[PDB]
Amino acid sequence: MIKAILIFNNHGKPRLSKFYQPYSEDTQQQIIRETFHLVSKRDENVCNFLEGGLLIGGSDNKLIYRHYATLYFVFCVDSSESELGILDLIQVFVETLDKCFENVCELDLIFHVDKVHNILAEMVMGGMVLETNMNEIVTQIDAQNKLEKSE
Amino acid sequence: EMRILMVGLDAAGKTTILYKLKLGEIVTTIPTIGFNVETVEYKNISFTVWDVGGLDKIRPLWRHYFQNTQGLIFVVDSNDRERVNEAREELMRMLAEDELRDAVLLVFANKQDLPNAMNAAEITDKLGLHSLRHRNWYIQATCATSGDGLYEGLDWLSNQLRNQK
Amino acid sequence: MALKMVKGSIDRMFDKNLQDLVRGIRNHKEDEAKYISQCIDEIKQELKQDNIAVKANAVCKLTYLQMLGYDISWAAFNIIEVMSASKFTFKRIGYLAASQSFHEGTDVIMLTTNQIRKDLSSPSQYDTGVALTGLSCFVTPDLARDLANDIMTLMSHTKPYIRKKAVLIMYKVFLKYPESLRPAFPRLKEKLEDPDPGVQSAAVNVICELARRNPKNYLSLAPLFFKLMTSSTNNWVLIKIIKLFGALTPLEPRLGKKLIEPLTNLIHSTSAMSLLYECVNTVIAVLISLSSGMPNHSASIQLCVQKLR
Ligand SMILES: Nc1nc2c(ncn2[C@@H]2O[C@H](COP(=O)(O)OP(=O)(O)OP(=O)(O)O)[C@@H](O)[C@H]2O)c(=O)[nH]1
Numbered sequence: 243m244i245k246a247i248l249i250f251n252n253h254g255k256p257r258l259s260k261f262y263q264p265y266s267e268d269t270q271q272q273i274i275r276e277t278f279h280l281v282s283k284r285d286e287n288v289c290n291f292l293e294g295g296l297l298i299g300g301s302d303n304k305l306i307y308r309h310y311a312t313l314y315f316v317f318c319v320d321s322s323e324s325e326l327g328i329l330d331l332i333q334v335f336v337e338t339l340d341k342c343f344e345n346v347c348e349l350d351l352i353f354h355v356d357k358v359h360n361i362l363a364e365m366v367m368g369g370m371v372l373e374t375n376m377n378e379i380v381t382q383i384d385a386q387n388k389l390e391k392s393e
Numbered sequence: 394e395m396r397i398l399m400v401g402l403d404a405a406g407k408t409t410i411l412y413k414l415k416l417g418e419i420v421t422t423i424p425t426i427g428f429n430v431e432t433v434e435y436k437n438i439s440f441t442v443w444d445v446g447g448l449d450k451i452r453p454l455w456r457h458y459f460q461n462t463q464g465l466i467f468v469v470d471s472n473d474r475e476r477v478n479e480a481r482e483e484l485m486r487m488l489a490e491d492e493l494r495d496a497v498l499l500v501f502a503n504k505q506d507l508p509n510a511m512n513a514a515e516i517t518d519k520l521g522l523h524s525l526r527h528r529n530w531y532i533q534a535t536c537a538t539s540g541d542g543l544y545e546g547l548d549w550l551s552n553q554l555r556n557q558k
Numbered sequence: 559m560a561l562k563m564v565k566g567s568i569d570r571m572f573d574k575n576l577q578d579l580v581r582g583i584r585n586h587k588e589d590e591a592k593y594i595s596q597c598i599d600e601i602k603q604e605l606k607q608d609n610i611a612v613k614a615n616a617v618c619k620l621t622y623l624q625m626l627g628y629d630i631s632w633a634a635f636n637i638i639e640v641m642s643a644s645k646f647t648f649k650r651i652g653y654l655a656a657s658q659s660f661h662e663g664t665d666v667i668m669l670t671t672n673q674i675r676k677d678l679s680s681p682s683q684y685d686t687g688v689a690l691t692g693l694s695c696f697v698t699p700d701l702a703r704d705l706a707n708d709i710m711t712l713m714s715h716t717k718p719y720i721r722k723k724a725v726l727i728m729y730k731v732f733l734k735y736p737e738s739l740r741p742a743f744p745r746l747k748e749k750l751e752d753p754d755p756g757v758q759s760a761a762v763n764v765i766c767e768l769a770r771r772n773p774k775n776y777l778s779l780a781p782l783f784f785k786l787m788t789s790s791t792n793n794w795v796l797i798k799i800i801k802l803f804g805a806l807t808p809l810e811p812r813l814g815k816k817l818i819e820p821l822t823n824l825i826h827s828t829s830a831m832s833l834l835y836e837c838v839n840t841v842i843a844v845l846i847s848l849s850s851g852m853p854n855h856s857a858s859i860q861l862c863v864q865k866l867r
């Protein structure tokens with residue numbers, strides 16, 4: 243399913259890197275760089291459904307991406323995934339980030355990435371989609387936040 | 394708290410002793426693939442005893458828990474006559490580490506309930522506790538099922554570790 | 559004594575947290591390598607301390623550096639300590655780091671066994687959930703063999719929150735330890751019947767993956783995949799089942815022969831264009847396999863192209 247989720251700016255600098263399929267650290271970095279060149283060089287009017295990279299294990303896989311301002315969001319998924327469904331999932335993931343960060347911004351990716359990962363973990367588990375209900379995913383996120391605040 | 398590393402052969406009674414000490418209860422145990430950590434306060438002194446598994450396959454993993462430890466506890470299965478040697482080679486190799494030169498060794502001779510358990514003196518002789526140099530040590534015949542000798546050992550451990558009332 | 563403790567606190571106040579690490583990197587980009595390697599050495603020293611909150615902080619910094627491509631595997635044991643912390647507020651940090659830092663070729667595979675099981679046995683669904691998601695990225699065939707014995711029980715946990723997570727990790731267990739898949743296969747079929755659709759959905763994701771990898775187990779389940787599609791109202795789930803159907807029809811055309819009706823009906827009811835495409839694409843493939851001996855597929859195609867238009 244989902245092999246990796248990457249978030250990076252227009253200079254290739256990382257904002258989030260979470261892999262599901264095992265890669266060496268160098269491979270991971272290289273995948274990011276590959277992805278950067280494969281995605282950041284695409285025009286705003288280019289189809290969000292791209293072919294996969296090669297470092298990830300093959301072009302059969304797909305790079306589903308979305309970007310705005312200077313930030314790029316790339317979902318490395320395999321050949322059996324729904325590019326359209328993924329894109330929908332990408333947007334609602336973002337909606338969750340807004341719900342939890344009261345409008346997520348780059349500074350949350352920069353200084354609150356641990357919670358971004360917590361949120362992400364609630365969205366995707368091991369590359370498999372863990373939650374699709376946007377109010378429930380927020381509910382569980384806050385349930386954990388409450389637990390933390392409590393003790 | 395006082396950092397104590399407690400080791401021993403598999404099925405010696407490390408888990409049973411640790412859980413009895415913290416909770417006063419003898420719990421059903423399964424082989425420790427990983428480790429256990431529990432912080433116990435005895436006579437106003439808190440001891441964080443790290444229970445590392447005693448299986449041979451994970452015996453090489455004992456190296457990761459040596460650092461900053463202030464005490465060593467060796468649960469001795471006095472009933473396991475067949476493995477008294479393996480216990481003594483393990484103890485000698487453990488004491489060969491320079492990281493444990495200033496730590497203290499308390500010896501728990503466990504499983505005294507069985508009729509064939511040897512006395513603590515024979516435990517010392519087999520483990521060569523008398524031949525140790527620059528090593529403050531004590532031995533106590535212990536019984537995991539009944540808990541006898543555990544509070545004396547804790548008292549001694551505090552006494553060497555603590556510096557005032 | 560007391561003032562030495564105070565000194566430690568004072569020194570602590572000048573120690574860098576994750577955000578400080580980041581800010582420093584941003585302020586020292588030109589000297590980034592110098593800055594970070596210095597911070598790493600400071601971390602090495604911090605991880606030799608007895609303050610788990612600080613050490614968890616050090617792990618947070620290392621986790622950041624993991625994102626930056628730094629080798630922090632030398633701290634894996636120390637990360638385990640963080641996972642063994644009495645507070646989940648630090649265990650979670652360790653599990654986060656472990657999910658991206660730990661590898662099956664390292665000795666953590668033995669070291670973590672008890673702590674993992676302890677967290678899985680913990681009544682706290684959030685501690686367990688955290689552990690499960692740590693395992694979802696870091697778990698071996700050996701961990702799969704022994705942890706599954708507890709996880710299968712977790713799939714019957716009171717909370718669907720956990721049942722759901724437990725189901726997805728069992729997929730990975732099957733990938734690494736198919737010997738558990740065998741007895742867990744019918745169990746999964748039972749998990750597909752879970753009243754809570756969120757868990758059920760996860761179960762669907764797993765069984766669809768299992769069928770994809772090994773079609774020999776879908777045949778008797780074809781009626782069930784049908785029922786799952788029929789009863790599901792979750793578009794993502796429908797996509798999974800439907801794509802599976804696209805992958806099953808080549809093996810059993812008569813499945814497609816029957817599916818084409820409810821799929822047609824589905825298409826008529828479909829409001830999501832993202833779903834619509836998947837539906838149309840799928841039935842086209844079905845119609846192709848059915849076109850031989852079925853001279854009405856062009857009417858179905860007519861519909862398809864109306865939708866394609
Ligand atoms: N008869 C007797 N049995 C004991 C005593 N103490 C522990 N046992 C039993 O010895 C067996 C092994 O005990 P554990 O505590 O699991 O041994 P361990 O040292 O933790 O073993 P590892 O986890 O493999 O390192 C269990 O069946 C205990 O009930 C004792 O004093 N007398």
Ligand SMILES: [Mg+2]
Nearest residue numbers: 407408425446
């Ligand atoms: Mg044990």
